[PDB]
Design a protein around this ligand. Sequence first.
Ligand SMILES: [Cl-]
Ligand SMILES: [Cl-]
Ligand SMILES: [Zn+2]
Ligand SMILES: [Zn+2]
Ligand SMILES: [Zn+2]
Ligand SMILES: [Zn+2]
Ligand SMILES: [Zn+2]
Ligand SMILES: [Zn+2]
Ligand SMILES: [Zn+2]
Ligand SMILES: [Zn+2]
Lengths: 157, 158
Amino acid sequence: DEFPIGEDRDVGPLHVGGVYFQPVEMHPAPGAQPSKEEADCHIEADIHANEAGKDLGYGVGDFVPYLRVVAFLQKHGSEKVQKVMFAPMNAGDGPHYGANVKFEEGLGTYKVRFEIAAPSHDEYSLHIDEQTGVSGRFWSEPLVAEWDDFEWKGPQW
Amino acid sequence: FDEFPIGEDRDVGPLHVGGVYFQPVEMHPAPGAQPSKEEADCHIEADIHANEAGKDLGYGVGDFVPYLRVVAFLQKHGSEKVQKVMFAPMNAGDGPHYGANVKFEEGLGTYKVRFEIAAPSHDEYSLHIDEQTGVSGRFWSEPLVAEWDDFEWKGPQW
Ligand SMILES: [Cl-]
Ligand SMILES: [Cl-]
Ligand SMILES: [Zn+2]
Ligand SMILES: [Zn+2]
Ligand SMILES: [Zn+2]
Ligand SMILES: [Zn+2]
Ligand SMILES: [Zn+2]
Ligand SMILES: [Zn+2]
Ligand SMILES: [Zn+2]
Ligand SMILES: [Zn+2]
């Protein structure tokens, strides 16, 4: 059972979905994320190309790899912001960006913000010649998919 | 655009690997130490997707497999010199693939062409491994090899 963070967002060339469910065990365990046991949940950003999309060379629905996704969580009533750096990984349902998360401020309603930066210049390229290449270019400022009334009430599993 | 084959597609481990070549291309940013569109002899690409075995790693069968480290080796028949070319991930009008603008340094002739495909770097990718939501497969330790022993560089076909 997966639970949605909110409705899917279309931002620039991306269709972005946000879900959460029980914490998972990952190998290798990424960055500084809490273990399956220490975490509150696992949050995932499902990012696929949309129609806009095709200008960068992607097929509609294709997973968009090499992105740098970071989530910002801020509890309503608090000025504290928790930053969570997602990591690319596979679950049984395919590649996505995700992280085990522990809500530092606890139960409550949160504003949840995904900032999605394009691949680093030395991490990806585009053919740009007329014969083989593409018309679109990667975005400069990270794209945003935001939900401002996400209710964290404890595990739903 | 016109693509020319390097040889027969290969199935190795959980990957289906195709190799093609065509005119040199202009890339943005210009990847690593790859020759420019003018300096190059051609552009070579490795089209890598998951096969049925890849399903155990969590990939959709037939889908692109990102974060791999693909390196090509070219060696002219009758020569001891080997060229090592690091491929970069990139998009063309037909989608993501790994590739490079390349010079065939020993000129026209038959070359052995070998693509060695390593799994993502330890800090570049992960797998869910819990029973509930994870996968039962794992990344390969020894790089996979797709190779063609008799590739004919007969010059530009453009
Ligand atoms: Cl915020
Ligand atoms: Cl490594
Ligand atoms: Zn490992
Ligand atoms: Zn995940
Ligand atoms: Zn640029
Ligand atoms: Zn150079
Ligand atoms: Zn492909
Ligand atoms: Zn020979
Ligand atoms: Zn191609
Ligand atoms: Zn290419």
